[PDB]
């Protein structure tokens, strides 16, 4: 690890959770 | 017919006019020159500035220390912005969800930027660039979507 891309791929991932986790509500309301 | 880079821009002139008021930052002027039609002021704008606000302030240990860590360790930071995007969005399926924190992830970065007296320029140009050109990648699915407007408007 401790390498420039795998620190930036660790910080997109951790928006993605973010993001799902958001997300999870959109649906289940709609339909 | 508003795209990303649009909306994005002005949440950002909508943030800082709201954060101890002061000169808009000079990369953030010539950005609305370089364009900007929709006023920071405009409904869809003020709209998205509470949304996206409560998005940080309820994430707000995360979007510190990923941005913290973000900054202080890249050399490009006009390219890993794209190379964060492209690991949500084109390496996976984009979200409604996805979308609305990376916005705020964005919106939170020029926060720590704008009204800085020590942060250098060529450092909030590449930010700003950066996040312009990477969030072009959301136009394309969100016109699918019905446009940023509509999907809050409900």
Do not use: G, I, M, V
């Given at each position: 690890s401790e390498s420039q891309e795998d620190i930036i791929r660790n910080i997109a991932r951790h928006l993605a959770q973010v993001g799902d986790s958001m997300d999870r509500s959109i649906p289940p309301g709609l339909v | 017919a508003y795209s990303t880079r649009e909306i994005l821009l002005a949440l950002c002139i909508r943030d800082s006019r709201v954060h101890g008021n002061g000169t808009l930052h000079p990369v953030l002027e010539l950005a609305a020159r370089?364009?900007?039609?929709?006023?920071?002021?405009?409904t869809v704008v003020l709209r998205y500035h509470v949304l996206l606000e409560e998005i940080i302030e309820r994430n707000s240990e995360t979007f510190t220390e990923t941005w913290n860590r973000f900054i202080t360790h890249t050399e490009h930071v006009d390219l890993d912005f794209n190379s964060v995007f492209l690991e949500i969005f084109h390496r996976g399926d984009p979200s409604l969800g996805r979308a609305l924190a990376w916005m705020a992830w964005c919106m939170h970065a020029c926060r720590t930027l704008?009204?800085?007296?020590?942060?250098?320029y060529y450092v909030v140009d590449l930010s700003v660039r950066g996040m312009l050109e990477a969030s072009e990648g959301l136009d394309g699915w969100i016109h699918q979507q019905g446009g940023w407007s509509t999907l809050i408007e409900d």
């Open positions: - | 370089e364009p900007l039609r929709l006023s920071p002021e405009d704008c009204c800085n007296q020590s942060t250098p």
